[PDB]
A = this chain, B = another copy of it.
Amino acid sequence: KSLLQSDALYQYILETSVFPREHEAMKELREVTAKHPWNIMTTSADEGQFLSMLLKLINAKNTMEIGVYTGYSLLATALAIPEDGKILAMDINKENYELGLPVIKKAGVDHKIDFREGPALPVLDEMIKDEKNHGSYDFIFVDADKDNYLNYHKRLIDLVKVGGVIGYDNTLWNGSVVAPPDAPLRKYVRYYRDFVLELNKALAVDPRIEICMLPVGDGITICRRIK
């Protein structure tokens, strides 16, 4: 499903504004992923289209992605940034990443990707220690844990430059953020729900960023660093 009022409205957007003129490598990868068990996690085409737009608009060149899976956001990112662009991508799996890596290579853009297998926090902590890494990123996309978002934000805010933009994905969490106390949901969404609400409250109050909650995909909260 989606966050709009009708699956038809959503589709109308896809059929008229996304699928036509959408590279193909995306189409390919989106096809490969459909065969995989956890494909429910791949990000939507409409949202990859928005990310493309945004990347272009802010003319980003150096970026980071936490939560790669298969590679949809990644591919989208690499096809948008300039030829000399660079992306630091982190995921705990890796086998899932290689499942899509063939398509990224087939789009001749895999060279902008530095994949690192393993938990993201450890890495973040080591980067903080080097003052050279501070304010060194144009864009940072966060589509991983959830119970770890606030933790990431603590070091991410010093890694993104003032120019800004950190994207926290899934902030509307399937709407569960307003589900009536009596409408049983999947155990995982019920679990991650407390963290999202908490995450959102913190972001709304954080003086170092500007923020915009866009109901595209499962919701992206765009944060622009102001200090």
Contacts and interface: CB of A to CB of B under 8 A. Distances in A.
Interface string A191-216: 00000000011001100001111111
A16 B204 contact: yes
Given A53-B210, A57-B57, A205-B20, A9 B3 contact: yes
A6 B178 contact: yes
A213 B13 contact: yes
B56 A175 contact: no
Contacts of A211: 17, 21, 49, 53
B5 A200 contact: no
A5 B8 contact: no
Interface residues of A, number: 46
A176 B177 CA distance: 27
Nearest to A18: B213
Interface in A1-40: 2-6, 8-9, 11-13, 16-18, 20-21
A123 interface: no
A11 B178 CA distance: 9
A115 interface: no
Interface in A125-147: none
17 contacts: A2-B5, A3-B4, A8-B177, A8-B178, A12-B178, A16-B204, A16-B213, A17-B204, A17-B211, A53-B212, A53-B224, A56-B210, A57-B163, A57-B164, A57-B165, A214-B214, A215-B216
Interface of A: 2-6, 8-9, 11-13, 16-18, 20-21, 46, 49-50, 52-54, 56-58, 163-165, 172, 175-178, 200-201, 204-205, 210-216, 221-222, 224
